[PDB]
Amino acid sequence: PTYKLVVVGDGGVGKSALTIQFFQKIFVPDYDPTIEDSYLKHTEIDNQWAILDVLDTAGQEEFSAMREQYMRTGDGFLIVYSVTDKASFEHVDRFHQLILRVKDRESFPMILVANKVDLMHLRKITREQGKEMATKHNIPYIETSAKDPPLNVDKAFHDLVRVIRQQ
């Protein structure tokens, strides 16, 4: 049993830092913005084991054969924005629309991820706005931090698996 998950969002919001924290349990700062890898691990979620196949998307400018196949065959999406980056929040609508267009569905497993909440002196998008926008798309909302010690990183990926299993 494999779940194919896709992490999407504007550049610089922490998709790589979240994915690396989830798989390798380390915080990698300033990770190369252009590397797009997928990662697989065998893990236990609610006493049910599964292989998690996670694509860390990078560089939506040019065509990515990797991203094309994961977007088409993916089982769930994490939509990440940074609470310190207003534009990454505003583009949540674009990613949401794109996922439903590719899947040709009125709804699909996704979770809205508000990252970098450890940066309390820089926070621009309030928790209210985030919950508002998740409510608007009728998807779950979770706040995360990839910096040690990490906040809700495992829970974000596991909750997406839970959404997929509860269809």
Contact residues: ligand GDP, CB under 6 A: 9, 11-17, 29-31, 33, 115-116, 118-119, 145-147
**Cα–Cα distance measured from residue 85 to residue 113, given in angstroms and rounded to the nearest whole number:** 13
User: Between 33 and 107, whose beta carbon lies closer to ligand GDP?
Assistant: 33
Strands 38-45 and 48-56: antiparallel
**Cα–Cα distance measured from residue 65 to residue 67, given in angstroms and rounded to the nearest whole number:** 6
Q: What binding mask, one character per residue, do residues 10-29 give for Mg ion by CB under 5 A, x or -?
A: ------x--------x----
Q: How far is the CB of 26 from Mg ion (least distance, A)?
A: 5
Question: Which 3 state secondary structure label does DSSP give 149?
Answer: coil
The residue among 167, 18, 1 whose CA lies nearest residue 78 is: 18
* Residue 155 counted as an annotated binding residue: no
> Residue count at the site for Mg ion (CB under 5 A)?
3
Residues comprising the binding site for Mg(2+)?
16, 34, 56
